Amino acid sequence: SMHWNDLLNSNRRKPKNEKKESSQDTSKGRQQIERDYDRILFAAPTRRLADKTQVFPLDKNDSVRTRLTHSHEVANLSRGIGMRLAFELEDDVFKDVSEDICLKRDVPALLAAIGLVHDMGNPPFGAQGAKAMSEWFTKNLPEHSDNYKDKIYGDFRHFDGNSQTLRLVTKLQILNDTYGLNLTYATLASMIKYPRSSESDSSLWKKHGFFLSEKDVVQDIWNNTGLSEGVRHPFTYIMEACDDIAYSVLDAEDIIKKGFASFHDLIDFIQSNQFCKEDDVAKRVIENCKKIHADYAQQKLSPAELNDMSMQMFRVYAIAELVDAVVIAFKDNINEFLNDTCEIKDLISCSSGKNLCQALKKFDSSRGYQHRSVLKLELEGSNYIKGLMDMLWLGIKGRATGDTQYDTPFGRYVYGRISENYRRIFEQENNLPACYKEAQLLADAISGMTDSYLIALHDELRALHQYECR
Amino acid sequence: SMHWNDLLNSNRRKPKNEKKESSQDTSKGRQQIERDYDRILFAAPTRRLADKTQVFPLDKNDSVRTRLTHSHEVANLSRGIGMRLAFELEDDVFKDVSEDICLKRDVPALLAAIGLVHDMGNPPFGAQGAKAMSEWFTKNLPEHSDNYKDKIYGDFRHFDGNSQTLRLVTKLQILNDTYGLNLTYATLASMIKYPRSSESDSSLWKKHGFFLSEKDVVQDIWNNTGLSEGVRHPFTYIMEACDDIAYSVLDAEDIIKKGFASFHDLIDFIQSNQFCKEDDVAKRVIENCKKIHADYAQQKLSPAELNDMSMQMFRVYAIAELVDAVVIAFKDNINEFLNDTCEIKDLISCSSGKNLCQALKKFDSSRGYQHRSVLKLELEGSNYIKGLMDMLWLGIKGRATGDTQYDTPFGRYVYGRISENYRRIFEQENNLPACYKEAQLLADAISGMTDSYLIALHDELRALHQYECR
Amino acid sequence: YIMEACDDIAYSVLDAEDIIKKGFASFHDLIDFIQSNQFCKEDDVAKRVIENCKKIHADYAQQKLSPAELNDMSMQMFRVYAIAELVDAVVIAFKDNINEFLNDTCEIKDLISCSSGKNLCQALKKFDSSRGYQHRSVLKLELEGSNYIKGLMDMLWLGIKGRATGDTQYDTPFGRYVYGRISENYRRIFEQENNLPACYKEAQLLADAISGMTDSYLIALHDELRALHQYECR
Ligand SMILES: Nc1nc2c(ncn2[C@H]2C[C@H](O)[C@@H](COP(=O)(O)OP(=O)(O)OP(=O)(O)O)O2)c(=O)[nH]1
Ligand SMILES: Nc1nc2c(ncn2[C@H]2C[C@H](O)[C@@H](COP(=O)(O)OP(=O)(O)OP(=O)(O)O)O2)c(=O)[nH]1
Ligand SMILES: Nc1nc2c(ncn2[C@H]2C[C@H](O)[C@@H](COP(=O)(O)OP(=O)(O)OP(=O)(O)O)O2)c(=O)[nH]1
Ligand SMILES: [Mg+2]
Ligand SMILES: [Mg+2]
Ligand SMILES: [Mg+2]
């Protein structure tokens, strides 16, 4: 029902400049989606992703994954799946594609680009950052108050990383042209994890994928790609499956490396798992891991080195099996994915690696996400985020509504400390409600920060807030 | 006279195991060079590259480029050049290539893999780090002494990161099997930037590219790829050109971002440069930058934002021009590169972007490399490295020659602090001289450390060295 | 008028020089700002200053100098030429409008605006505001100084209010010590019997006390009184 020509649209939102000369051409024999990948890679938020943590602290020299490393791994897995689709399963998947589209250069580049940018706008301090901002907005934007009675403010009471990522990649650049990185329609369409807003009440997607401010942009993307509300781009399923596989496997690897568990602990957990006792993929992975572990034990290795090698081989085998299962599932259900009324929640659940991935997620939650150190760090990050949000709100509230409670010197300094692009977007005259604009400015300010930068700003403003507090 | 079939050899050094069932296959429809890129990406040193610095400190939240970001940018540029070669200039570049080789999947993957791993084995604290090591090896391995009189010890007196990178990817893995990551012959051949040893005296290459311990491995690579001593793989020129372009442009960008200079300063430096006054590439870049800077000045931006965006446009123009020039130069001189007696020093010199790259390097050296803060940090890193090397040599010296000066408790402790794989390699019975083995152990230990890890280890050992020092 | 014009010229030029020296901008940045300024594109004084600066900068670039040294020399020559041009313009304007200045109903706002160096001085002021006055470090220091001043003023007001009106809320030991810490001449003027309102006298005493302080002295006094204010606060 949905044609690949529209889904792989290489046009961009910004109108083409007719004054450009041949000397200003920058493509240099590159496909448009490859240019999108290059734009994402060379963006400042991509580099700042290194300073933002993923699960565990990033300053312990334990080679744990950060946002940048996780994004690169997801991009690599998506690129590999794209190579498989465009070089082996072209006939099965891309049945009707115009000759003007080079699948072998576009599909891998598109998958890599959407994988690399999938977690670009998430708040710092992991998922606890988004949770903390959601709690702060719920407390400071009460639903019973007439100013925030509207459901649109749910965009902040249930703050999502994906909506902020779309806003950042589309509107939050230095130039205020509502075009951002000016990615192709295919990349923007594939980037939308949840094609619905908080105003909508879709039961298929629990979260919302875009803010109220980006509603027109998302409508344009849907119009230029043949999609609609509630319908997810076919490559978004691949990107989500790759993200799930990557985080589930590499978080277990990081847990083993950090000493919170051991390779034998993971093997026993998978073997004793209720759904993994009879799963073929899990059985094959366990058999391969044990076979390699015997040979490794034959050699001379320290216990930590043996654990590391066994974990590495487990990662290799699990990633291979899960990627193969995901590719097979996508190939088998390609017609349903291309259907205009697709209702598949995720690609992994339709594959044979569902049980293994679910067991890995459970192991990561039980061993790593609920670890005492991780919980303490999450609480510290929540305190930092909430304190900084209160301090910034002291200098933001009333700036658009009309009240002058921000005119204190601390308020003016705090407002000046926010990045210039965010303030420029906030001061622009549009149809958004004033309270919505203030809350969006605060969310944009906090979301773009890294852990170290957020902590430093919080400490600095706490030092400068002493007089006003008393 | 060299053939692309040998240069793109996808075989690996490790003998292919015969007792492997189909259930243990992890290729999953991947080309071997793609698996090489995946192995490089998922390796622990690749993740640890984020903690290693390139020019400027990492703790500042200015989004300056680390070793990981620089390697990823180099890999992206090499991948783009490979896509251009395999999709547009296939007839001009690749002739008499076997149908078994899939150029469209191998060439971009090979270039990306060699770009990503090009700086995996460099010592921390930037280039000065390696320099510092050389100084230490010059003092503690005196040339006039009979023990260290042979030229092979020059391998440490002129320590270079490329030889250590080759050793890391070939031997310095946890599993001691002399195969390392088991990369393909094409990747290993393209990785060797300087195809000569310290003992060999060649006027073509300034530095050596491999240690004495890797002489047999390099000979095997040359035998299996058709190369020889002093002959460089054709893709190594592309990788080196991409590395030069990336560092020269992005170091200027980081200098401007850090505030050590401004966009107008760079424009004036390029315009007033003796060789860039009449250079076509430099003139075009300056014209495009000014044309876009006028339009950007039409809008309302802060001076910092204007500088940042103007230099962003400068980057997107200069990188495009330099990449196009490098591709054209490689296409034109392909016969000379394929010759068994190639003498070209670098690809950029043969290109038309030579003057712009030279001017950018001069600007980086004058403004960023010789800045006061960078010099102070380099001195601190040199002090840290030399102190740690002294403390480690206290526990390494005599471990192989036969002396017992290491038997002190501090010596045993610092020997135990070194990673187990390095000690396993050092204790293995081989033909290397004992002094060479000790020096190699120290070099492998120091090179594999990150900045923060090196500082922490130095401080800890200094704390523990108090009793024996007195 | 002459004093105000000299003050304007001095601060506008030397603040730009200090901005360049401190690294917040560069000589080429200032040259581009002046050249691209709307009112300085056709101003004769600005054109002459830019031409002289470029002519001297070429010769300086011929010599061997570090980038910081080249910036410093170019800034010094810009200061020399701009100061000369602005002073000459101010003198000419004062000489031409001397009768209006001596008029009993003079309505001239400033001497620079009547001179030919008006555009250059205005552009220099805009450059100083955009680069130096709104710099992040300057804003943070301004906020710190504001906090220090307001805290010290509250602490001193604790020991001043009511001293002349009649209320005895100052009789706490901290209030008496704070009053004793103020300079003797200010207190002697405040205690003098005159026709000023009591609240006006108290406010004037506080203003005289704070205004005569320096940065280091104000910070030290604020810290000392904060240390001595712990018991009264609780
Ligand atoms: N610190 C911490 N992180 C968690 C926890 N649970 C999940 N995470 C992390 C791991 C994953 O990156 C991610 C998993 O959450 P989701 O799968 O729901 O991600 P998202 O909603 O963005 O899209 P998705 O469901 O993957 O399609 O958050 C937890 O309990 N504690
Ligand atoms: N901190 C610091 N870094 C430098 C300095 N000079 C160069 N670098 C940076 C730039 C490069 O990424 C790298 C050295 O560049 P080179 O081209 O000279 O390296 P190499 O001799 O291996 O030749 P090649 O890269 O193959 O063209 O370190 C310096 O003086 N101080
Ligand atoms: N920290 C800071 N200082 C400023 C700023 N704007 C002006 N200044 C400084 C520079 C000058 O010394 C002086 C400029 O203010 P005025 O020209 O109004 O001085 P004033 O009113 O005393 O008399 P005048 O106008 O010169 O005749 O204050 C600012 O935005 N931040
Ligand atoms: Mg993710
Ligand atoms: Mg490099
Ligand atoms: Mg003055």
Residue numbers in the entry:
A (entry chain A), B (entry chain B): 0 to 469
C (entry chain J): 236 to 469
Direct quotes from the study:
pmcDeoxynucleoside triphosphohydrolase (dNTPase) enzymes are effector proteins in animal and bacterial cells that hydrolyze dNTP nucleotides and inhibit viral replication. We therefore named the dNTPase-NTase anti-phage defense system Clover and designated the dNTPase protein as Clover protein A (CloA) and the accessory NTase protein as Clover protein B (CloB). Clover defense encodes an accessory enzyme CloB that synthesizes an additional nucleotide signal p3diT that suppresses CloA activation and protects uninfected cells from aberrant nucleotide depletion. p3diT binds to CloA in an allosteric site adjacent to the dTTP binding pocket and raises the threshold of intracellular dNTP levels required to trigger full Clover immune activation.
To define the mechanism of nucleotide signaling in Clover anti-phage defense, we mutated the Salmonella CloA active site (H126A/E129A) to allow direct comparison of dGTP substrate interactions and determined cryo-EM structures of CloA in the suppressed CloA–dGTP–p3diT (2.6 Å) or activated CloA–dGTP–dTTP (2.6 Å) states. Remarkably, the CloA–dGTP–p3diT and CloA–dGTP–dTTP structures reveal that p3diT and dTTP each bind at the CloAAB interface in structurally distinct sites that remodel to accommodate the inhibiting or activating nucleotide signals. Specificity for p3diT binding is mediated by CloA residues that make base-specific contacts with the Watson-Crick edges of the first thymidine base T1 (Q311B) and second thymidine base T2 (D37A and N75B). However, in the p3diT-bound suppressed state, the dGTP substrate is coordinated by comparatively minimal interactions between CloA residues that contact the guanosine nucleobase (Y246A and Q377A) and β- and γ-phosphates (Y193A, D243A, and K206A).
